[PDB]
Amino acid sequence: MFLQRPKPYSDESLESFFIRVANKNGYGDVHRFLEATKRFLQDIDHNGYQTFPTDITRINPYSAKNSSSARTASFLKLAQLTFNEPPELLGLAINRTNMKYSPSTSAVVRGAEVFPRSLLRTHSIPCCPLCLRENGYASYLWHFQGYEYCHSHNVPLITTCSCGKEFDYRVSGLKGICCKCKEPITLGHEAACTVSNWLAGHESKPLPNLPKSYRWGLVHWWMGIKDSEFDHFSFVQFFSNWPRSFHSIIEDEVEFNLEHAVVSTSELRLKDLLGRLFFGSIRLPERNLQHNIILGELLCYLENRLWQDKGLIANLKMNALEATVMLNCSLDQIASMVEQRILKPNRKSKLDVTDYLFHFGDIFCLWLAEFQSDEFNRSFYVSRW
């Protein structure tokens, strides 16, 4: 097997790249190519040929169950061996990552770009028929919810043929022809266009100029705020009023929960007053306060309200689990700060990972004294007050 590389595009999906490789190298379709590629890897005894996928919908390493590192080893070998000139193959693939988006969503990565798993499309993947016909390849952005309009042609992406059959370019090809009726697939909220342009990485006021992974983070965050599908209109609205618009969400959240508080003030946990908002904002995907503007604003608000109302904020209860996520440290690290005299529990008996033994004020001052990094530190939000 020896292949001509197609014209490289840095925004091409991995599936589109393989489709073009198949088309331009005389294979009948991508499936025949993937089967021939698996046979090639078997003929050179590359460990991992057994799990090489022949289903174009399962090609990315995130789709591998147990063989994700055999998959990346395979792409590396193919890149380094089977082309006249080596293509960028690994850089187009969507891999799993270790990162999380708060509170508990997993994530994936392509190149240097991290995405919440909640945004990774599970079923049919849409397309822009204008992009396919004019460019001859598919964008990786079509794999991710939130990107609902083509930022270059300013029209909504298309999911289904007018005949009713869903059009997935991965299965039906880059020519944009419906598999069932054999007709060419054929086609304006500016807010949708604004956030699509922003997601693509371009300046789009009033949305903030953050690294790409944190833009996807804000989409995930907004979804959680509303507990529903991403609403482009209220998102743009929100940022057109930033940061006051967020100061109102915080204040309104505290005042509602404090009033609906049925337990004693001394028994109030941080989760009871600011649960959703605080623990939903810590990793978007990380705690870099130049980039995680939600956490920066929240922490600036909390430092400056710390000791008001005889320590309302400072006294809010937390457990060891919550402190570890706050501080980005291990439970074992927490135990060592409590057995020594650095972290002091409220109830002085003589560590339940889950009992609410600590006070926000103590954990906050512990962060300052022991857990600031070059990215996650007070100096990056003091200008927000």
Contact residues for its own copies, defined by CB under 8 A: 61, 64, 66-73, 76-77, 80, 88, 90-91, 95-99, 109, 111-114, 211-213, 285-286, 303, 306-307, 328-330, 333, 340-343, 361-362, 365-366, 368-375, 377-380, 382
* Local structure of 308: helix, strand or coil: coil
Query: Given its phi and psi angles, is residue 2 left (phi above 0), alpha (psi -120 to 50 degrees) or beta?
Result: beta
Span from 77-85, 162-170, 211-219, 291-299 in contact with Zn ion (CB under 5 A)? 162-170
- Both tokens of 375, joined, read 């990215």
Q: CA-CA distance, 311 to 4, in Å (whole number)?
A: 68
Cis amide linkage into residue 206, ω under 30° from 0: yes
Binder of residue 70, out of Zn ion, its own copies, none (CB less than 5 to 8 A by kind): its own copies
According to DSSP, residue 102 is labeled T
- Considering only 36, 81, 130, 312, the residue that binds Zn ion (CB under 5 A) is 130
**How, if at all, do strands 155-156 and 149-150 pair?**
antiparallel
Number of residues that this document lists for the chain: 385
CB of 282 to its own copies, least distance (A): 16
H or E element in which residue 317 lies: strand 317-318
Q: CA-CA distance, 223 to 213, in Å (whole number)?
A: 16
CB of 383 to its own copies, least distance (A): 11
Binder of residue 361, out of its own copies, Zn ion, none (CB less than 5 to 8 A by kind): its own copies
Pattern of binders to Zn ion over 16-35, x per CB under 5 A?
A: --------------------
Q: CA-CA distance, 203 to 135, in Å (whole number)?
A: 23
Span from 51-59, 154-162, 285-293, 317-325 in contact with Zn ion (CB under 5 A)? 154-162
C-beta of 60 vs 196, nearer to its own copies: 60
Binder of residue 379, out of Zn ion, its own copies, none (CB less than 5 to 8 A by kind): its own copies
Q: CA-CA distance, 120 to 107, in Å (whole number)?
A: 9
Interface contacts to Zn ion, rule CB under 5 A: 128, 130-131, 150, 152-153, 161, 163, 165, 178, 180-181
